[PDB]
Amino acid sequence: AMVPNVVVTGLTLVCSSAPGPLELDLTGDLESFKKQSFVLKEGVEYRIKISFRVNREIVSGMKYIQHTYRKGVKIDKTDYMVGSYGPRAAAYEFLTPVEEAPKGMLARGSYSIKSRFTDDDKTDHLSWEWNLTIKKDW
């Protein structure tokens, strides 16, 4: 019953050329995301923003992991060192480095992403799955 130390609250696909916000509420029904997808125009630059809270004590070596799949096969594993933070009221926002969506007919279509937010103790702070669809246009 003790309040949880880490609460992961949001994922945002940050892309200033997108026509509207691309956001997941990670305190909600995570299974529903598997039936949804964000559309990104091919070749565009974007970042991922993970929003989280630390409530009671220092967290060491937070890490964000994304495994990307296409048609059921894992095509990439990337880890990000999110860092170490004390408790505070205000949200923390971590951003991945800018990347470019792939482009071309071969690369277009849907991708599924398995995300995990962890730390030096390998605690599963939250794991979730979401989808991206790469299209010629928005």
Of residues 122, 18, 16, 132, the one with CA closest to residue 65: 122
Q: Please state whether 72 falls in left (phi above 0), alpha (psi between -120 and 50) or beta.
A: left
Instruction: Report the SS3 class of residue 33.
Output: helix
Residues 6+ away with beta carbon under 8 Å from 63: 79, 80, 81, 82, 117, 118, 119, 120
Domain ranges for the chain: 1-138
Return d(Cα 4, Cα 94) in angstroms, integer.
20
- Write the single-letter amino acid at 47: R
* Quoted resolution (Å): 1.3
Contact yes or no for 41/137 (Cβ under 8 A): yes
Q: Which CATH architecture fits 1-138?
A: Distorted Sandwich (2.70)
- Write the single-letter amino acid at 67: H
